[PDB]
Amino acid sequence: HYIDAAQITIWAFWLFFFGLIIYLRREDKREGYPLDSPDLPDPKTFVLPHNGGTVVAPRVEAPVAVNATPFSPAPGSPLVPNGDPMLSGFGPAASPDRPKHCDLTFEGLPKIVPMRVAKEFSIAEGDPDPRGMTVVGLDGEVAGTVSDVWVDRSEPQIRYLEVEVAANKKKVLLPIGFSRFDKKARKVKVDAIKAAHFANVPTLSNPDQVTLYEEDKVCAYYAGGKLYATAERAGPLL
Amino acid sequence: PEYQNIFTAVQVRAPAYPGVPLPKGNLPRIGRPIFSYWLGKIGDAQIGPIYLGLTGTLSIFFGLVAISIIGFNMLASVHWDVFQFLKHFFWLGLEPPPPQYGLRIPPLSEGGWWLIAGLFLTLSILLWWVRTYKRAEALGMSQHLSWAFAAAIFFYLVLGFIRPVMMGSWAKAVPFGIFPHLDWTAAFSIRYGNLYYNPFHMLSIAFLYGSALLFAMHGATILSVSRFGGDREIDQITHRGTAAEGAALFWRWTMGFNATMESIHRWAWWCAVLTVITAGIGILLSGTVVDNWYLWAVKHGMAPAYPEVVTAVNPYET
Amino acid sequence: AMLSFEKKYRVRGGTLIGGDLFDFWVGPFYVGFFGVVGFCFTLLGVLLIVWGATIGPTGPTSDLQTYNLWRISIAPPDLSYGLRMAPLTEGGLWQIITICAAGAFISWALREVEICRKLGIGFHVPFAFSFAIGAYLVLVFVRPLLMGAWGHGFPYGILSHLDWVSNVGYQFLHFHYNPAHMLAISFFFTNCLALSMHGSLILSVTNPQRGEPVKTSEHENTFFRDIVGYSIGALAIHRLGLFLALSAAFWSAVCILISGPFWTRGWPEWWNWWLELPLW
Amino acid sequence: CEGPPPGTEQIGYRGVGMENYYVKRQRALSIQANQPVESLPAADSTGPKASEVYQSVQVLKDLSVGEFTRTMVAVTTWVSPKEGCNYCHVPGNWASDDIYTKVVSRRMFELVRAANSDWKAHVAETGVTCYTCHRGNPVPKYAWVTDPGPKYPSGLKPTGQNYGSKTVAYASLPFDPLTPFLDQANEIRITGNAALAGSNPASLKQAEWTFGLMMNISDSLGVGCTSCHNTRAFNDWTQSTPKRTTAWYAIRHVRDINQNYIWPLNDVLPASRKGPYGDPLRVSCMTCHQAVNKPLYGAQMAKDYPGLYK
Ligand code: BCL
Ligand code: BCL
Ligand SMILES: CC[C@H]1c2cc3[nH]c4c(c3C)C(=O)[C@H](C(=O)OC)c4c3nc(cc4[nH]c(cc(n2)[C@@H]1C)c(C(C)=O)c4C)[C@@H](C)[C@@H]3CCC(=O)OC/C=C(\C)CCC[C@H](C)CCC[C@H](C)CCCC(C)C
Ligand SMILES: CC[C@H]1c2cc3[nH]c4c(c3C)C(=O)[C@H](C(=O)OC)c4c3nc(cc4[nH]c(cc(n2)[C@@H]1C)c(C(C)=O)c4C)[C@@H](C)[C@@H]3CCC(=O)OC/C=C(\C)CCC[C@H](C)CCC[C@H](C)CCCC(C)C
Ligand SMILES: CC(C)=CCC/C(C)=C/CC/C(C)=C/CC/C(C)=C\CC/C(C)=C/CC/C(C)=C/CC/C(C)=C/CC/C(C)=C/CC1=C(C)C(=O)c2ccccc2C1=O
Ligand SMILES: CCCCCCCCCCCCCCCC(=O)OC[C@H](COP(=O)(O)OCCN)OC(=O)CCCCCCCCCCCCCCC
Ligand SMILES: COC(C)(C)C/C=C/C(C)=C/C=C/C(C)=C/C=C/C(C)=C/C=C\C=C(C)\C=C\C=C(C)\C=C\C=C(C)\C=C\CC(C)(C)OC
Ligand code: HEM
Ligand code: HEM
Ligand code: HEM
Ligand code: HEM
Ligand SMILES: CCCCCCCCO[C@@H]1[C@@H](O)[C@H](O)[C@@H](CO)O[C@H]1O
Ligand SMILES: CCCCCCCCO[C@@H]1[C@@H](O)[C@H](O)[C@@H](CO)O[C@H]1O
Ligand SMILES: CCCCCCCCCCCC[N+](C)(C)[O-]
Ligand SMILES: [Fe+3]
């Protein structure tokens, strides 16, 4: 027809494009599908190293009840957390149940471990040793002090700070991402939670390591405080 | 207030990392690590072990040759005065064979030099490719990189080698120079009736703009979920965490859909690769299939029309 | 409908303004006060773009009127109007639609803020997004201000705006010579490279050669150290990519910003300062 | 690089992007730098014609003595006010053509006369005068010559002019932005009139030459490509501005000036007026316009001297 080659080349592309999106929208569904009342792609298997295991995606995961109740029966309505908001494990305090194994270095040793275990590690020349500083919650009260430092042995860095809580002398983790330093005073400010809240931070089923399961529970705890650490945070700003 | 995860406030050291052990037939790993408190402020401070086999070395050499052929020429064009060479460097360049030659091989001083800088450059490029291919198998990994690089080469090759040859004229290739290669860019569009109306030029922009939209999206996202250790994209793909969850939901709630920790990197890979592919296709058809893109767009009812507030009598029409 | 792990996060509260009033979802989208204001700006925005197509550049009966998607165009007012409001059919429409686009875009960002507050995650995304809104604002608001007229803004048409870019650049004879422009392009290019590099790396480890098991972070770095003797690491590469992309938007914003308001001559001429150095 | 607010002018339809920007500060200084020298009082226009009282008057023939003298008084200040009458004359022998500056001047009365009477499609009723290019100087500040910058040009060059008459002289010149288009007459057009390919041989090199030439023209007139084009279609005359038409006739006008007015005088001009290649200082757009869309902001000087018309 009055059809030119530039035309037919644009058709081919778009044909490959549409086909592409489809492939991509199928991979977008290797997690979280089928939805809660592009098709699903046949499972793909990941072969974990060392001891290992085997993950498939998409997989069928058993539902886990929600620790909250519909603020309203209308669909699309939010839910209120049950009990003491920070205890809930709902909303910003939520988290899934990741494996109860530890992430491993290439050799296969608990990757994330404290400086009292990765013998080698060491603070950096011009940088304060966090060890021994005072942790202060969102309002100011002291919380405890840094009893140690957990690090990644694969990609050398501080992932967590160990925290000996005063109020109970228990050791809890604090992700670096939630900790701001104030070197010129040697403090480790913490907007996440209040001094008191440090008492309920999930604890380690071994003081020489943390599991994927345990990492989430920790961060999630602190995160919850971002909306549940105050009765005004949780509310508007208007 | 809140740490933004932009600058590591406290770094830590451990013996440098020599890397994973390579298999059967991989020379030692030259160079010995060093650190730099400052690189560390924004990233892994280890500056370390480089691998150099036949390939990679054979690539730097040829690669420096072409760069060398280009420079002396630039030195030659300004009469060999290194003062003048330095002063006008931006405007210097080594142009491709003139049209008179078609695809004949001309004397060095009449384009043969361009072909030699082209020959060796490509050679060094096609060699770094192989380099990046070896290095990824020795580690059991896949060839996603070498296949993306192969994508950028295709555009490069199309510019200076494929299109000229199909068109039977080295003079259609790109000149080696900073400002000169810029002038070529503008003239090329002028010569072919405005490249804005080239459909594949439009697609490549969308893909170039989108690659900026995407990286900004993925990067800001992964940082915003770093508190939950979202950067460890490796285990979140195998063992989905609240990071991959807070992430996917930020998007589902924003734009109605979302990806996965793994799949987002496929949207990214593909969005980048299609930038150079639609580009070469775009240049491939230029002059070869279409001669005036604006007109083509008119033939396809795509060009906007405006009230004629300004017009000029055509003198050619006495 | 929700993902199979989404309910545990659909908490109540986290708003900025409004509280329980609009704190709900519709399908997968979270609404919020900013979902309502945003939708209002968009709708009047779109509905106005529709009536404009209806009227055409001359009249609803004109031969220039069109409903073809490539040719529809809503253009700014003449420059003769300066910073004044222009008659609807003489650039008025464009003036209103712009306010809506800005209101629509700013709400979207503000809506990402509430969504972030609800998840206890950082606000990097809406921070980064405001860079695209700034670029848009510089093109449609700031620049036209420094120049003294709204007509300096680009028109709203799929291809007509490409006609604008073309004619604004060539006003400078050779726009490629804009130094800020050269910077932005380098960023756009470098980003596209990094993005492809990041993409490739992850999928290469989470999916290696057959037989092999999922790779590790050490591999990532061992490869990137192998190829170019350095690896910036997981965290930082996401840090880098965001830098490049935001920078692309920034230098794009200044490149046009300096073109007209602070530099009126051709662009190749700017480079004279280099041919006049005393070094020579 | 300072500014706010810049001067601006709308050229095309709103939204199309065809507008012009400039520094007011410098536009005012420029206006001050391009002032025309005021005219001389009218001349008693009675009596015999110059050609009746003089012996070697081959051009300003039909002018009255008074107007003739006046024309001489004006042309002096316009070309060589510091040298006076004696610049183009042999003392004691006003009629002798025994000095190159008289043979050239005579020829330059014909260049102007021609400009004003035959090239109105370009110069309209504004016209030109000696002052236009000279600005009180014996050697026009903006006359040009094919000079070798410190860099080597592309050995390639538009194919001469597509001719072989008095062209052996152009063969000794390397490539230069202007000569091949505003002296010789090679093809500037490269854009095709058909969408599909297989029928347009213009080269990319040709594209660059036309782009180059155009950058010169713009700079010479102190404008941007939108003063004449709609860059979405450079070749489209219906989408262009009436200045493009005018610039077209200007390109020919300048070709006629250089070819039949400057080059022929090449044998009677001293070496000091020729470039390293032996070519003479000739005319380009800069020569008259000197960075303004209209020489001396379009001041109308010529209308006062009838001696400058055929
Ligand atoms: C006035 C001129 C024209 C114009 C002319 C062109 C031309 C001509 C081309 C483009 C092309 C592109 N343009 Mg443009 N373009 C214009 C206006 C625009 C605008 C705009 C906002 O106005 C945008 C954003 C675009 C956008 C783009 C890109 C999408 C695209 C380039 C892809 C790329 O990744 O390059 C960067 C990528 C590469 C070059 C790959 C590099 C690969 C190799 C392997 C690396 C080698 C390095 C080497 C070893 C180093 C050593 C060298 C020695 C030192 C010597 N253009 C106007 C309309 N456009 C390209 C296209 O797609 O056209 C169809 C193209 O060819
Ligand atoms: C012939 C003219 C010139 C020229 C003229 C111009 C001019 C003039 C301009 C540029 C600008 C740009 N050019 Mg150019 N340019 C040329 C050649 C090039 C080449 C090339 C390969 O030759 C390149 C790569 C570039 C590169 C670039 C970029 C640096 C820059 C545009 C990016 C941007 O602004 O993002 C910034 C991003 C945005 C503005 C987008 C904001 C998006 C918003 C707010 C949200 C949108 C939502 C939407 C409405 C909803 C849709 C969703 C659906 C509902 C589902 N140009 C030629 C030489 N260049 C422009 C610039 O720098 O602008 C700042 C500019 O104005
Ligand atoms: C599709 C996505 C894009 C993309 C992708 C891409 N590029 C890539 C890759 C990928 C996936 C690689 O794997 C490869 C890479 O990064 O390898 C480590 C690369 C690469 N992309 C590069 C450049 C590049 N990519 C570009 C664009 C793009 N690349 C696209 C946007 C551009 C442009 C024009 O925008 C450029 C400039 C290189 C960094 C690299 C490939 C380099 C290469 O092949 O090696 C050739 C070798 C030599 C020339 C030797 C140089 C070695 C010398 C030691 C240094 C010389 C400098 C000298 C000191 C100056 C003075 C000279 C002396 C002699 C006096
Ligand atoms: C600085 C980084 C870059 C960037 C970042 C960025 N963009 C973003 C984000 C981020 C981080 C988001 O979070 C947000 C998003 O939700 O992405 C999925 C977004 C986004 N970037 C988008 C587009 C986009 N970004 C672009 C560029 C960039 N985005 C930069 C490169 C471009 C271009 C031109 O390069 C486009 C087109 C959207 C997908 C999305 C913004 C969604 C949104 O704001 O929705 C609200 C508004 C509407 C649904 C429509 C309103 C329409 C009107 C009221 C009238 C329209 C008038 C209009 C101005 C004229 C028509 C334009 C003509 C030119 C064609
Ligand atoms: C009436 C109603 C529905 C109420 C809702 C409230 C609203 C939306 C108000 C605003 C107003 C109005 C009227 C809007 C209507 C619009 C509708 C129905 C939807 C919105 C439109 C919109 C902006 C669409 C954009 C679509 C595009 C092309 C986006 C470009 C980016 C792109 C190509 C993305 C594909 C890749 C993806 C999915 C990226 C997200 C993404 C990233 C970046 C990750 O890093 C990440 C990491 C780990 C897990 C997942 C992810 C992930 O999903
Ligand atoms: C005049 C032009 C205006 C339009 C502009 C077009 C821009 C692209 C489209 C924007 C998406 C709209 C709303 C999002 C989906 C939604 O809101 O609803 C949800 C549906 C249903 O997903 P699900 O039920 O399977 O699972 C529940 C999870 N959503 O999402 C999808 O299937 C995925 C859609 C992704 C497609 C993105 C690819 C864009 C193609 C580009 C088109 C041309 C541009 C040039 C680029 C090369
Ligand atoms: C004096 O100099 C010293 C000694 C100090 C050295 C320093 C050198 C310097 C300063 C160099 C500077 C170089 C610069 C600035 C280079 C810039 C280059 C740019 C901007 C290039 C841009 C684009 C180039 C392209 C697209 C070219 C592509 C060319 C290709 C693909 C050519 C391929 C050619 C082939 C395959 C030839 C095959 C040969 C045969 C004969 C087999 O073909 C039939
Ligand atoms: C100085 C004020 C001045 C005078 C006086 C003057 C006079 C003059 C006469 C009388 C003639 C006619 C000679 C004859 O008998 O043929 C004449 C002719 C020409 N002039 Fe003149 N002129 C004066 C100044 C100048 C200057 C500064 C120039 C050149 C820039 C100049 C040029 C000429 C030319 C040429 C002619 C020839 C006229 C013709 O052929 O029609 N003179 N001069
Ligand atoms: C005006 C009627 C006019 C006169 C008179 C005139 C005279 C003139 C002379 C005497 C020379 C020779 C100078 C020398 O010493 O070599 C000369 C040379 C050039 N001119 Fe002329 N000229 C008059 C008008 C114009 C106009 C309007 C232009 C521009 C289109 C023009 C251009 C030139 C050029 C070029 C030269 C050669 C350069 C040189 O020899 O100085 N003049 N002019
Ligand atoms: C701006 C720096 C500028 C450019 C670029 C430009 C380009 C251009 C092209 C590519 C052509 C050839 C079109 C074709 O192939 O048919 C062309 C031709 C003409 N132009 Fe030019 N032009 C730019 C600037 C200007 C300006 C400022 C003017 C006006 C003074 C102008 C004029 C013209 C004219 C006249 C032509 C026609 C030439 C002919 O027919 O021989 N341009 N321009
Ligand atoms: C050189 C090739 C050249 C070009 C191009 C050119 C263009 C040009 C235009 C577009 C105009 C009109 C500007 C407007 O309408 O705003 C114009 C006007 C005049 N020109 Fe010119 N011109 C070129 C060269 C020359 C040369 C060498 C001379 C000198 C003899 C000259 C002179 C003039 C004059 C006088 C005018 C004014 C006309 C008017 O409308 O008042 N030009 N030119
Ligand atoms: C009409 C043809 C549509 C083309 C389908 C586009 C999907 C391409 O997607 C490809 C797969 O096909 C490929 O096998 C994998 C493996 O890593 O890489 C993907 O990126
Ligand atoms: C990235 C967004 C670009 C959207 C592309 C717009 C294409 C418009 O689609 C056009 C219609 O508007 C037109 O009237 C018909 C019928 O001949 O042809 C279609 O291709
Ligand atoms: C970006 C365009 C939107 C901004 C529009 C601004 C309009 C301001 C109108 C104030 C002047 C009033 N009036 C009556 C003279 O038009
Ligand atoms: Fe990532």
Side-chain angles (χ1 to χ4, degrees):
Chain A
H1 178 219
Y2 288 124
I3 311 306
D4 61 79
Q7 223 172 161
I8 102 101
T9 320
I10 265 302
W11 290 346
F13 174 72
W14 283 132
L15 245 63
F16 162 88
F17 194 56
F18 180 56
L20 178 65
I21 297 312
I22 279 163
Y23 158 81
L24 292 180
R25 288 297 300 153
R26 262 149 83 75
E27 302 280 320
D28 288 9
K29 304 178 173 188
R30 288 224 196 275
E31 302 276 8
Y33 281 78
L35 306 200
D36 261 12
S37 48
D39 176 14
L40 277 221
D42 290 324
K44 59 130 64 158
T45 312
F46 290 103
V47 171
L48 318 195
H50 288 327
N51 9 306
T54 274
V55 189
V56 266
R59 72 203 72 77
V60 238
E61 41 166 45
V64 183
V66 179
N67 198 5
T69 61
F71 172 59
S72 194
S77 156
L79 297 94
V80 173
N82 294 342
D84 163 25
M86 322 263 321
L87 94 86
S88 57
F90 168 80
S95 146
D97 295 342
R98 317 190 52 194
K100 265 162 204 125
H101 87 218
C102 272
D103 209 357
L104 319 161
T105 71
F106 173 53
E107 258 106 309
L109 310 188
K111 179 188 286 161
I112 163 88
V113 300
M115 301 191 61
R116 88 176 120 74
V117 167
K119 46 285 194 257
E120 45 269 347
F121 287 68
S122 8
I123 296 306
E125 210 65 13
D127 277 326
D129 183 325
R131 271 175 312 196
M133 301 160 65
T134 115
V135 193
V136 274
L138 108 236
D139 245 357
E141 316 319 276
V142 168
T145 61
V146 186
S147 75
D148 208 358
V149 165
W150 295 49
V151 297
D152 197 330
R153 288 150 104 162
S154 291
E155 199 169 280
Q157 59 178 107
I158 284 168
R159 294 271 181 206
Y160 302 101
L161 289 190
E162 224 194 32
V163 191
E164 190 166 66
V165 214
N168 57 307
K169 294 295 223 322
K170 268 171 153 182
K171 104 154 187 202
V172 319
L173 289 192
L174 165 66
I176 184 73
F178 282 106
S179 28
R180 260 174 54 134
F181 295 85
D182 184 299
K183 341 269 192 90
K184 250 199 88 57
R186 275 201 101 212
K187 247 165 225 165
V188 188
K189 303 161 152 257
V190 184
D191 183 80
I193 68 193
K194 265 174 183 286
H197 305 307
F198 274 95
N200 297 285
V201 179
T203 66
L204 308 176
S205 108
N206 177 331
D208 295 343
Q209 27 164 97
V210 54
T211 57
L212 295 179
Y213 179 96
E214 285 171 325
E215 307 207 54
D216 269 43
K217 299 304 149 165
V218 173
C219 321
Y221 178 75
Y222 287 91
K226 279 290 195 180
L227 174 80
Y228 304 141
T230 303
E232 298 105 290
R233 254 174 182 197
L237 242 105
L238 243 160
Chain B
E2 237 318 282
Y3 176 30
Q4 257 50 91
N5 224 341
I6 298 298
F7 301 113
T8 302
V10 174
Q11 308 162 29
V12 302
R13 303 280 156 270
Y17 199 76
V20 172
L22 322 175
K24 230 307 294 188
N26 301 253
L27 325 182
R29 272 222 263 288
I30 106 159
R32 249 356 132 217
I34 221 129
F35 297 98
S36 108
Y37 167 95
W38 289 94
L39 221 60
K41 246 57 225 287
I42 72 173
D44 147 82
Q46 176 169 314
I47 293 180
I50 317 102
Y51 184 83
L52 214 55
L54 173 44
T55 320
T57 193
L58 230 49
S59 169
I60 297 197
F61 168 67
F62 287 176
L64 286 169
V65 172
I67 302 172
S68 287
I69 290 158
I70 293 179
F72 284 133
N73 263 278
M74 303 189 153
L75 226 206
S77 86
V78 74
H79 291 95
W80 296 89
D81 182 350
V82 193
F83 199 68
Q84 226 52 29
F85 162 84
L86 274 162
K87 173 179 191 205
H88 300 277
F89 173 64
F90 298 138
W91 299 256
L92 304 188
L94 167 60
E95 317 276 331
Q100 357 169 158
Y101 294 89
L103 290 174
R104 296 162 33 219
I105 305 288
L108 298 153
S109 80
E110 258 180 294
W113 277 138
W114 184 96
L115 290 178
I116 212 173
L119 174 52
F120 286 33
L121 194 46
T122 296
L123 226 53
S124 66
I125 284 178
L126 284 165
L127 266 190
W128 193 265
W129 178 87
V130 171
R131 172 203 183 46
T132 71
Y133 179 106
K134 280 329 192 330
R135 298 315 88 217
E137 63 170 5
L139 295 167
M141 295 163 85
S142 307
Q143 307 301 336
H144 288 260
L145 196 72
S146 40
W147 287 135
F149 192 8
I153 307 186
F154 163 85
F155 180 36
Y156 160 80
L157 281 189
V158 168
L159 284 164
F161 194 66
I162 289 166
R163 194 172 156 282
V165 173
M166 302 173 46
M167 301 206 55
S169 164
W170 305 119
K172 315 212 162 262
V174 200
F176 295 108
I178 279 153
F179 287 179
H181 101 300
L182 284 187
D183 300 347
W184 176 96
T185 303
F188 193 103
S189 167
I190 275 155
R191 168 62 183 86
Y192 297 105
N194 196 349
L195 221 67
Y196 276 130
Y197 290 88
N198 178 154
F200 284 85
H201 181 249
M202 300 176 177
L203 281 163
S204 185
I205 289 178
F207 287 128
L208 180 78
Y209 285 177
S211 293
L213 196 213
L214 270 192
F215 215 156
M217 277 171 59
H218 176 71
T221 278
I222 294 309
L223 277 212
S224 83
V225 104
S226 210
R227 31 186 86 180
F228 310 89
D231 36 291
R232 291 206 248 153
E233 300 187 305
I234 324 95
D235 60 63
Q236 298 261 328
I237 282 153
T238 53
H239 307 121
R240 192 194 69 222
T242 185
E245 295 187 0
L249 284 175
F250 166 75
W251 293 108
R252 198 192 179 63
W253 297 355
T254 302
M255 42 165 221
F257 65 111
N258 67 267
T260 67
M261 198 62 94
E262 200 209 331
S263 98
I264 180 52
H265 289 108
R266 277 165 195 295
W267 273 96
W269 188 91
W270 271 112
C271 174
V273 154
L274 291 178
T275 303
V276 292
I277 294 190
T278 53
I281 285 166
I283 293 287
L284 277 179
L285 301 158
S286 288
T288 243
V289 172
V290 175
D291 185 72
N292 177 327
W293 290 111
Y294 172 81
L295 252 16
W296 180 89
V298 171
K299 160 161 159 162
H300 295 270
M302 300 174 209
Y306 311 105
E308 175 184 291
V309 178
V310 114
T311 205
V313 176
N314 182 347
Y316 283 104
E317 292 182 340
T318 313
Chain C
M2 317 181 213
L3 291 162
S4 78
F5 55 70
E6 164 169 10
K7 210 174 170 185
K8 25 165 186 262
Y9 301 91
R10 258 149 111 123
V11 74
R12 162 204 177 203
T15 75
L16 287 183
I17 88 102
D20 305 339
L21 191 39
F22 301 107
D23 194 4
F24 60 84
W25 289 260
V26 170
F29 315 84
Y30 164 64
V31 177
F33 172 87
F34 287 116
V36 175
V37 183
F39 170 100
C40 292
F41 275 121
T42 297
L43 184 102
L44 177 67
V46 158
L47 277 205
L48 289 173
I49 285 173
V50 162
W51 180 58
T54 282
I55 286 291
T58 37
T61 130
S62 164
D63 356 310
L64 311 170
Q65 188 266 314
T66 168
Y67 278 118
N68 176 292
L69 293 196
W70 300 106
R71 320 202 291 273
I72 288 156
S73 172
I74 321 290
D78 279 345
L79 304 186
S80 39
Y81 287 104
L83 303 170
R84 309 199 284 291
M85 167 69 31
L88 271 207
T89 47
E90 301 297 338
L93 274 190
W94 180 95
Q95 274 168 144
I96 296 171
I97 300 166
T98 290
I99 297 167
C100 298
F105 300 155
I106 297 159
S107 301
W108 188 272
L110 288 188
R111 180 174 155 269
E112 291 181 340
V113 166
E114 302 201 340
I115 293 197
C116 288
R117 291 177 50 135
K118 251 196 211 284
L119 290 140
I121 56 174
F123 302 83
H124 301 71
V125 172
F127 162 72
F129 178 32
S130 54
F131 268 76
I133 298 179
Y136 170 66
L137 287 182
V138 173
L139 279 169
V140 122
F141 177 66
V142 191
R143 178 167 189 272
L145 245 190
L146 275 25
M147 304 246 260
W150 300 123
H152 290 284
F154 69 91
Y156 300 145
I158 301 177
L159 279 163
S160 93
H161 85 283
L162 274 67
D163 283 355
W164 180 86
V165 178
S166 192
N167 290 311
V168 170
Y170 277 121
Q171 192 282 160
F172 301 89
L173 322 187
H174 211 144
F175 215 85
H176 281 139
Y177 281 59
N178 179 329
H181 191 260
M182 315 181 167
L183 225 126
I185 295 184
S186 318
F187 275 121
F188 269 114
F189 282 165
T190 314
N191 175 88
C192 178
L193 193 181
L195 185 66
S196 82
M197 296 223 288
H198 184 33
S200 295
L201 190 53
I202 299 294
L203 306 174
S204 64
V205 297
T206 54
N207 321 228
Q209 255 134 248
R210 192 56 268 121
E212 295 272 326
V214 171
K215 294 286 154 172
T216 83
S217 169
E218 279 104 335
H219 293 239
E220 280 175 15
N221 292 328
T222 289
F223 165 98
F224 260 65
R225 284 206 174 101
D226 270 6
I227 310 298
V228 291
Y230 183 58
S231 183
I232 189 157
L235 187 42
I237 190 43
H238 282 100
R239 211 122 59 139
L240 180 56
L242 176 54
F243 170 63
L244 300 178
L246 288 181
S247 256
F250 183 60
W251 292 107
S252 293
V254 351
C255 102
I256 197 67
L257 193 38
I258 60 186
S259 303
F262 301 92
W263 185 252
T264 48
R265 286 183 274 189
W267 272 119
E269 182 175 338
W270 183 80
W271 291 91
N272 274 4
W273 74 267
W274 181 276
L275 306 168
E276 300 178 357
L277 293 183
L279 321 198
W280 26 72
Chain D
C1 265
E2 291 50 49
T8 74
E9 283 163 328
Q10 185 182 344
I11 295 168
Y13 180 57
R14 55 192 183 84
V16 195
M18 295 169 59
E19 53 200 42
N20 183 240
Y21 321 132
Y22 65 82
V23 162
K24 283 152 152 147
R25 208 205 130 242
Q26 276 123 229
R27 167 62 37 106
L29 302 214
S30 170
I31 295 178
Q32 276 317 66
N34 291 265
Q35 294 283 349
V37 281
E38 37 140 13
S39 304
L40 294 151
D44 171 46
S45 79
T46 65
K49 305 325 206 185
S51 78
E52 264 182 87
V53 298
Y54 293 124
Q55 311 183 220
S56 186
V57 169
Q58 301 159 239
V59 166
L60 307 167
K61 282 164 162 265
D62 314 324
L63 272 68
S64 105
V65 193
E67 192 58 59
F68 183 90
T69 308
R70 182 175 171 254
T71 299
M72 288 288 130
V73 176
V75 165
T76 309
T77 51
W78 285 342
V79 189
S80 57
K82 285 180 257 307
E83 298 86 348
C85 314
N86 283 352
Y87 195 66
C88 319
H89 290 281
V90 186
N93 207 176
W94 306 93
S96 175
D97 297 342
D98 201 41
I99 178 174
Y100 86 92
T101 69
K102 166 114 182 276
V103 167
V104 182
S105 299
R106 172 130 59 215
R107 194 54 184 147
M108 299 247 137
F109 266 114
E110 303 187 302
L111 175 162
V112 165
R113 282 184 144 228
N116 307 351
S117 290
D118 308 328
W119 290 101
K120 298 190 166 152
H122 170 192
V123 291
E125 304 302 344
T126 282
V128 296
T129 76
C130 312
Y131 200 67
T132 297
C133 304
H134 289 286
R135 308 295 165 101
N137 286 251
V139 190
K141 192 172 170 186
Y142 299 101
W144 63 282
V145 97
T146 300
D147 55 24
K151 183 208 166 205
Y152 266 123
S154 68
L156 195 29
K157 148 186 209 193
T159 180
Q161 164 189 36
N162 267 30
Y163 267 142
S165 36
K166 49 172 275 196
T167 67
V168 18
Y170 295 120
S172 305
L173 308 180
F175 169 83
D176 82 78
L178 312 182
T179 311
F181 302 103
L182 305 178
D183 196 332
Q184 289 170 116
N186 283 95
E187 199 42 283
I188 297 168
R189 288 176 300 183
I190 68 285
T191 314
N193 311 275
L196 303 171
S199 173
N200 175 177
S203 66
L204 230 265
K205 208 58 208 228
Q206 285 170 75
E208 313 184 277
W209 289 332
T210 288
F211 185 19
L213 161 62
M214 293 289 145
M215 291 204 259
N216 255 259
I217 296 185
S218 309
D219 271 337
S220 304
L221 271 69
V223 303
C225 323
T226 65
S227 184
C228 310
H229 296 280
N230 177 311
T231 65
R232 75 165 172 173
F234 281 112
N235 64 110
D236 195 320
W237 287 88
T238 68
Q239 297 203 258
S240 318
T241 74
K243 311 282 169 151
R244 198 190 165 190
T245 299
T246 298
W248 189 94
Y249 286 122
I251 294 182
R252 278 61 188 172
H253 188 357
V254 163
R255 271 158 181 191
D256 180 62
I257 284 171
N258 280 336
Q259 288 253 124
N260 331 301
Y261 292 78
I262 305 295
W263 277 99
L265 298 172
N266 203 14
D267 290 276
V268 292
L269 288 149
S272 74
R273 320 311 201 206
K274 292 162 201 175
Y277 294 110
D279 55 312
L281 297 167
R282 12 189 209 308
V283 169
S284 78
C285 308
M286 243 325 222
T287 309
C288 281
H289 295 252
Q290 295 179 40
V292 173
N293 70 308
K294 275 182 195 221
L296 301 122
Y297 292 80
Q300 301 172 108
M301 293 194 88
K303 76 200 288 173
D304 300 331
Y305 297 88
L308 305 176
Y309 289 83
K310 291 182 145 196

